[PDB]
Structure formats: C-alpha cells, structure tokens
Amino acid sequence: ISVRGLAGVENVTELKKNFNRHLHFTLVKDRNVATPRDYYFALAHTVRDHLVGRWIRTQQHYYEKDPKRIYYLSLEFYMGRTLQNTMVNLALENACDEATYQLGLDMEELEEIEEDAGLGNGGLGRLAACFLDSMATLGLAAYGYGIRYEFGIFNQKICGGWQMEEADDWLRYGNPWEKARPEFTLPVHFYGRVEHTSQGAKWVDTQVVLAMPYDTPVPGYRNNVVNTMRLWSAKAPNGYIQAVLDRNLAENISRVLYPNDNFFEGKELRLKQEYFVVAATLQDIIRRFKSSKNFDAFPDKVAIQLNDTHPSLAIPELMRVLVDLERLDWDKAWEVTVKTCAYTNHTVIPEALERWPVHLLETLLPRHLQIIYEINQRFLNRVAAAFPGDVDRLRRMSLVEEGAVKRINMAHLCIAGSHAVNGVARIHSEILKKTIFKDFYELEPHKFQNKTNGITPRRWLVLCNPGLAEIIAERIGEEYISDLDQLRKLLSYVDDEAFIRDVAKVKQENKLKFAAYLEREYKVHINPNSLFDVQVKRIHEYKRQLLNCLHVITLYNRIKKEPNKFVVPRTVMIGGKAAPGYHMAKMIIKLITAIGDVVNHDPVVGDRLRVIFLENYRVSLAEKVIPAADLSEQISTAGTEASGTGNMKFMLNGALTIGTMDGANVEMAEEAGEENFFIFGMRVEDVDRLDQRGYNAQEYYDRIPELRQIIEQLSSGFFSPKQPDLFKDIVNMLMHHDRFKVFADYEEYVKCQERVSALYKNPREWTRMVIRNIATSGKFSSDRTIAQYAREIWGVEPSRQRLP
Ligand SMILES: O=c1[nH]cnc2c1ncn2[C@@H]1O[C@H](COP(=O)(O)O)[C@@H](O)[C@H]1O
Ligand SMILES: COC(=O)N[C@]1(C(N)=O)O[C@H](CO)[C@@H](O)[C@H](O)[C@H]1O
Ligand SMILES: *Cc1c(COP(=O)(O)O)cnc(C)c1O
C-alpha cells in the first residue's frame, strides 16, 4: 500500500536495531522469553523515539516565534491507541512493517496489544481527540489540557445478556507515549473562606491538592509538528498511618472518568475534577504569557476554548487570578476574559446541562461563587439597559436559577463570559439561537456561530481502512489525506467499472476481516454475505436503539409470516455502553440480546437474519466495525442529536446512511444529495407539532397491526419466557412516557428500510451510491472544522507548511 510510505533500507536497518536495543535495555528481556506484549512495547518505544526531536523542536519553535496560543480545555480526550497513528503521521508504517516482518513478527498482531486510551464517553471525547490531531496537522500552537484518569470508561462485559462494568485499568502495563513531568507540578486549592481587606479579596485557609502534569505528543500529518496534550494527575500535598492512607482522598480527584454520556450528575467529586483541570491549566497559561514577549495583550496571545461547560470555571478562575492576584481593575479583567474565552455547546437535552447548586459552590469554591454573583449582576445590568422593563428576561437570562435548590447555570455563565458561542452542526446552532439561547442571541447576536463537527481522515480512513485509502490514492493521489474536499474528484468514477469493482472488493474484504475478528476474539459467527446493518453509539433513549429493535422484530415476524419469501440477508449489529445508573439503557441492552436469543436460534430464519450485540464498543472497535459496515443507523429523534460524528466515519468508510434529519445528518444528506441517502421520519417541525397537540403512543398502537404484534410479544414474555414481565418497563415507557416518540417514526422507518434492502439487491447500484457518498464526505474532515475555529474564533491562520 503506497499511502503507507517507504521502507528504506537504512531506515528498516535502524528500526530493527532500535527494536532490539529497547527489548534489551528498556524492557530488560531476552528473545527466548519475550512475549508478543514485550515485542509490542519494543516497537512502541522504537516508534516513540521518532517523535522526540520534533516534539522538542516544535515547542521550542513556539517559544521562539511566540504565536497566539490555543488552549483547548476538556474533561475528556478519547484518544484510543497511539502506535499506528504515530507511524502513519510520521510516514513510518511500511518501514516498521518491513522491519518487524524481517524480525519474524506481524506488526498488526502487535498493534492489537495496545490498550485504547479511553478517557472519553463518546462523541464529545472523540471530537476532542480528532481536534488535537487536526490542530497539529494545521500547524497551530495548540495545547490540549485535561485530566489523566487512572480509569477511563469502564470495560463492558455482557453476562447473561446484561451489561456488567469492569474497571478499565489501561495503565497496568504502562503508557510508553506520555512523559511524566513532576517538576512542573502545581497547587490547586479547595474550600477555604474569603477575607476582604485593604488589598481587596483573599482566598485563605484552603486545602491543597497538587496537579502533576503528564505530557503526550500529538503529531500532525507529515508536517513535522508535534504538539502536546497535558493531562493533570492529582497528588496529596507534602494517627500517622491513617494520615498517610488518607492521601487517597485528594488523589481520588483523577481516579476515574464519570461514565455519563449526555447526562449531568451533580456530584461534588465531578466539580472537583472540573476546577482541578481549570486551576492548574490556567496557571500554565499565565506563566507562558508572562515569559513571552502586559495583560492588555493577553487575548492576542491566548485563546481558551471550552469543550462544553465542563471547564466553565475557567471564566471566574481567570477573573480571580486577574483581579485578586494580578490586581487588575474588574472592568479591564472582564474585557480580557471575554476576549480570551469561547464556548462550544454540544447538547440541548435539558438533563445534560450543568446546573450546580450554589451551596456546593459556596462550600468548595467560595471565591468563585462571589465572582460569579458579581459577573451576573453586571451582566443583568446590561440586559436591563438593553431591554428596559423586561423583567422576565432578567429572570430567564440570570446565571442564577431560583428553586428550592438555588443553582448556577453554567451555560449562561459561559455565554456571558465568552466572545463566541458555537453549536456543533448547522441545525443545532440554529436551534440554539431560536430556543435555548434565544434571549442571549437577541442581546448579542454576533457572539453566536456554528462549527459543524468533523472527524480526522487519518485515524478514520488511512488507519482504519487502508484498502479504501489505497484505491482512492491510486486514482487521485495522496493530497486528499490532509485536504479531504479532494475526494469530490471521485465523482468522476461513478461509472468507472474498475473503481466500482474495487470499492465493492474493499468493503467485502473489511467484512471478512471483521467476521474473522468476531470469531477469534468473541467466538461469534456472522454471515459474511449479508448486509451489515450497524448501529454503534452510546445506549440512549434519544438515539432510539429501541426503534432499531422494533424494526428487527418486524423483520423476524415477517419472515415467520411468509417463510418462503426471499429477503435480503442481514446481520444487524448494535453496540454501545450504557451509563451504569441509567436503568432504561440497561434494559435496552438486555432486550437487544434477548431478541437475538430468539431470532438467532429459529431454524426457519437460518442465516437470513442475525441480531448481535457488539460488546465493549470503543474507539478501537469503531476502527474495525465501521469500515465493514454496509448500512449506518443514525436514527435519533429529530432535534435531539446535536451533531453526531459516528455518522460522518460511516460515510467516509463506504456505508450508506439511514437516518432522520437530525444533527449533521442534514448536512451529510445535503452534501451527497438526498437521492443518495435514506432519510426518513419526522423533521423537527413535525416533532414540535406533535408536542403541541400531545403525543399519544396508543394511537399508533391502535392503528398499526404489526406494531401491536411486537408490543404484545414483549408484554407477554415472548422474548423472556422464564421471566414473562422482564420488559414491562420498556413497554410502559413506550406506551406512556416516550419523550422520543419511537412509535411515531416506526412506519416510515420500516418502509425506508425496505427501500434499503431493494437497493442492496442491486450490488452495482448500491456501490455507485456508495461512491457518491464517499466522494462528498470531504466537508466532514476535522481539518475543515478546526480551520473554521482558527479563522472565525481564535483569530489565527492555519498552515500546512512543514517544519524542518
Ligand atoms: O527561559 C527559557 N530559556 C530558554 N528556553 C526556554 C526557556 N523557557 C522555555 N524555553 C524553551 O521553550 C520550551 C517551551 O516550554 P513551555 O511552553 O513552558 O512548556 C521549553 O521546553 C524550552 O525549549
Ligand atoms: C454534553 O453534550 C454532549 O456530550 N454532546 C454530544 C455527545 N453526547 O457526545 O457531543 C458530540 C460532539 O459535539 C455530538 O456529536 C453529539 O451529537 C452530542 O450528543
Ligand atoms: C465516534 C464515536 C462515538 C460518537 O458516535 P455517534 O454515533 O455520533 O454518537 C461514540 N463512541 C465511539 C467509540 C466513537 O468512535
């Protein structure tokens, strides 16, 4: 494969030399007892050596040049594995492949040893990771800042058809990429009280937790740029035994990632994590600023991007530093703060927005609450000046929410304290200005923007689908890898017989490889000559895995009704993690496995239909299953999925999409042409009209015989004979408390699925439509998204110029 680079003779020689050297000196092993794991580590250290010179030169270059610095703060960075990504970005893949082969090893088998760095829940976490990759590739002096969790998202086991959570001890064998930096450890304060003297305010009597940074290299695509991701680790400050044991209390701050996707859990520990990242990060930012070329120019030299409201405390924290410590007058400090910060909102689901009770804030961060109240007062003074007499607007826009439990609306704080606020897909950003943040948009229309998400073509095409990346390069070269819009050139081949044959060959190759993986690793057998119908994403009610479930049972029931009637064979795969405390999501996973239990063992169905639940869906699994997918399920209720990103890996990897007009699905359909998509169901307007007159699930049940049959099968125990009432909760929700209107999209979804099967019956036309999708996926590269952030928000110009 040409996109994988050269395997120079000297390079290969040197690599084998360093591989053996590391096995000896670093791993302290000898070939006779070395395990595949040992070899994986020897290769990883060998590959890591190649990043060092560039890492040092890059950071040195920024200190010398002093460009504006981009600080991307996030509580999640779902990086996945690093070995292949590093070889790809450094053009070492073929060289290492040859070197390892000459050493009698299979590089791919070695790659399977590496643990996914799973410091993320799903979309938002992965976006942070794609963004890091694009910022480096675009030559931006960007710094990823987060927290080094000891345990990322739990490993999902399925036992008896149910999800079981196991700690994700990803650091057991170490992390060869990161570099501990204990020398740059910083103090973070908690609790305490505030004193107002003659020098202003003073935060005193605080408890200290130390933040120790660990730096990870972030390589751009062959431009010799290696940026940094700095993750903070909590350390206790500098009878007796119990006192030493109690050091765990402070160190617990960075122990584990809260496993919630699109759900706010107001736990004090989570608040600590948020302030922890923010306080330490901002000390780094101020220090760099001071040793650069004073505060008037701070915004010209610093950009702080908030990945949702998670690190929103950065606003009052910056004000605290500027006012309490640097002694800037409030007004000036605020001007600087707003010009420095920008907020990215990723959801409209109300239960996902952060609203911290004021008592928690008053106790844990007394000075920050005082600063927040002052920010609010001045902000509401401006609202009042702009809309005199509009008292309810004041109440609505306030950073303070009034109930039994007074809370602080973190999103309102972010809008008030940021010069830019953006949504993550056109429809979502428009919805923001129309509903949720309408008052704010009216007060400051210019603050509001859109930055449609993207995914990186390196990990999500070149790494995961080398076969596809190769046939594409065969026709248009390699420029598209960091200029995805060039994929448009592929429209010239919709009628090219060789390309049509190869696109289909590549997909079938991936399907065989994926089938081999499931047999080997999970001992699951799937029919390779079936349509691979895939819905992989976190289990949620709004994502409607349940709708997928209704369809699957429909397919089963239709086959049983007319057994001799031909149907396009399908392997329906659903995978994803459920937050541990999310009851319905866990019941849904169980229904999925229970459906398979019946469907997969009915002799009449045979291999015409199979339903499997893919265990432990994570980034590394996404890289295997997405390239093998024929149909991509993106069926959230219109208006609920802010953007989605899995939708865009599927499109880029040759799968056709069946989905609603939600999030970026809208833009995806627009780019490819609705005739090349399988859009169905209610649009946002329809959902609202239903909400206006009231959603009554009974009407659909009463009017659709096939739906009725399925609900009665669930309620009577057809999918749980030993426990007839097992799914009563799902049925009750669907029939009476379905916020996401599953029944309302059932008929159109089943009809749309019929249309999917019809096209699949025509391999040639299925493939030509696929080509029209791949060819128009360019807009969804994260390089485009990031270039937009740079020019429209950060005020810096991206660049593809190589470093020496
Ligand atoms: O005072 C200094 N003298 C010379 N080089 C420096 C100095 N401070 C930082 N650097 C260089 O700039 C890099 C950037 O460090 P940082 O951005 O503060 O993490 C350092 O690793 C050094 O190469
Ligand atoms: C707190 O809000 C979120 O986490 N929002 C989400 C997500 N759950 O991943 O963010 C990602 C990245 O923007 C979006 O693609 C997705 O539709 C949205 O739901
Ligand atoms: C991309 C990705 C997600 C987000 O997928 P959506 O379908 O947009 O929710 C979640 N998990 C992993 C492992 C991903 O790679």
Backbone CA torsion sign across 526, 532, 538, 541: negative
Q: Which of 424, 536, 540, 621 to mutate to test the pocket of ligand 3 (most atoms within 8 A of CB)?
A: 536
Q: Which of 52, 56, 59, 63 to mutate to test the pocket of ligand 1 (most atoms within 8 A of CB)?
A: 63
Q: Which of the 8 DSSP states describes residue 150?
A: S
Q: Which of 354, 343, 307 is closest to 77 using CA atoms? A: 307
The closest alpha carbon to 656, from 679, 636, 631, belongs to 631
Strands (DSSP E) contained in 296-339 are 302-307
Q: Which of 441, 370, 449, 455 is nearest to 412 (CA)?
A: 441
∠ CA 263-267-268, rounded to 5°: 145
Q: At what angle do helices 93-102 and 9-21 cross, to 10 degrees?
A: 60
Looking from the CA of 442 toward its CB, the CA atoms found within 13 Å total 15
Specify the DSSP class assigned to residue 33: T
Smallest CA-to-CA distance from 545 within 624, 609, 641 is with: 641
Find out whether 437 and 111 touch, Cβ atoms under 8 Å.
no
561 is catalytic: no
Largest CA distance in the chain: 89
The CA-based angle 457-349-572, given to 5 degrees, is: 55
Pick the CATH number of 455-781 from 3.40.50.300, 3.40.50.1100, 3.40.50.2000, 3.40.50.720: 3.40.50.2000
Tell me whether residue 802 is annotated as binding: no
Residue 4 designated active-site: no
287 CA distance to ligand 1 middle (Å): 11
In ligand 3, which atom is closest to the CA atom of 634?
7
For residue 758, how many other CB atoms are within 10 A of its CB? Answer: 12
Q: Please report the DSSP string for 574-620 in residue order.
A: EE----TT-HHHHHHHHHHHHHHHHHTT-TTTGGGEEEEEETT--HH
List residues bridging with 733 in a β-sheet.
none
Q: Are strands 302-307 and 69-73 parallel, antiparallel or unpaired?
A: parallel
**Is 614's C-beta closer than 6 angstroms to any atom of ligand 2?**
no
Q: What are the distances in angstroms from CA 438 to CA 350, 434, 450?
A: 15, 5, 15
If you ran DSSP here, which 8-state letter would residue 124 be given? H
How do 162-166 and 407-409 pair as beta strands?
Answer: unpaired
From first CA to last CA, the distance across the chain in angstroms is 26
Contact 128, 118 (CB under 8 A): no
CA 399/CA 382 separation, integer angstroms: 13
Cβ–Cβ < 8 Å for 482, 497: no
> What residue type is 511 in one-letter code?
K
β-strands 656-659, 631-634 pairing: parallel
Cα of 305 vs centre of ligand 1, distance in Å, is 23
- Helix or strand or coil: residue 799? coil
Cα gap 416→432, rounded to integer Å: 15
Query: Are residues 641 and 543 in contact, defined by beta-carbon separation less than 8 angstroms?
Result: yes
Dihedral sign, Cα of residue 786, residue 791, residue 795, residue 798: positive
**Alpha-carbon gap, residue 477 to 112, rounded angstroms:** 29
- Please tell me what DSSP assigns to residue 256: B
Report how this structure was experimentally obtained. X-ray
Spatial separation of the C-alpha atoms in residues 610 and 125, rounded to whole Å: 31
Report phi then psi at 624, rounded to 5: -100, -45
Three-state helix/strand/coil letters over 686-755: HHHHHHHHCCCHHHHHHHCHHHHHHHHHHHHCCCCCCCCCCCHHHHHHHHHCCCCCCHHHHHHHHHHHHH
User: What's the count of helices (H) and strands (E) in the chain, helices before strands?
Assistant: 32, 25
Question: H or E segment at 12?
Answer: helix 9-21
Asked if residue 221 lies in contact with residue 205, where contact means CB atoms within 8 angstroms, the answer is: no
* Phi, psi of 495, deg, nearest 5: -115, 10
Kindly list the domain boundaries of the chain, sorted by start residue: 1-454+782-802, 455-781
**Which residues, other chains included, contact 166 with Cβ-Cβ below 8 Å and sequence gap of 6+?**
154, 155, 156, 157
Pick the catalytic residue from 54, 459, 511, 543: 543
Would you tell me the crossing angle of helices 545-561 and 705-716 to the nearest 10 degrees? 100
d(CA 628, CA 117) in angstroms, rounded, equals 23
Task: Please tell me the distance from the alpha carbon of residue 528 to that of residue 608, in angstroms, as a whole number.
Answer: 11
Confirm or deny that 30 is annotated as ligand binding: yes
Distance CA 234, CA 780 (A): 36
Residue nearest to ligand 3 atom 6, measured at CA: 646
Q: Is 180 exposed, middle or buried (0-12, 13-18, 19+ CB in 10 A)?
A: middle
DSSP character at residue 151: B
**537 is known as an active-site residue:** yes
Q: Is 59 in the pocket of ligand 1 (CB under 6 A)?
A: yes
Enter the tokens of residue 743: 């029944």
Classify the phi-psi angles of 455: left when phi > 0, otherwise alpha if psi is within -120 to 50, otherwise beta.
Answer: beta
- Ligand 2 centroid – CA 640 distance (Å): 10
417, two tokens? 């304290």
Write the secondary structure of 445-467 as one string of H (helix), E (strand) and C (coil): HHHEEECCCCECCHHHHHHCCHH
CATH 3.40.50.2000 corresponds to the domain 1-454+782-802: yes
Pairing of strands 656-659, 678-679: parallel
Helix, strand, or coil here: 350?
Answer: helix
Does residue 343 contact residue 221 with C-beta atoms inside 8 Å?
no
Q: How far is CA 474 from the centre of its chain?
A: 31
Tokens of 692: 């206006």
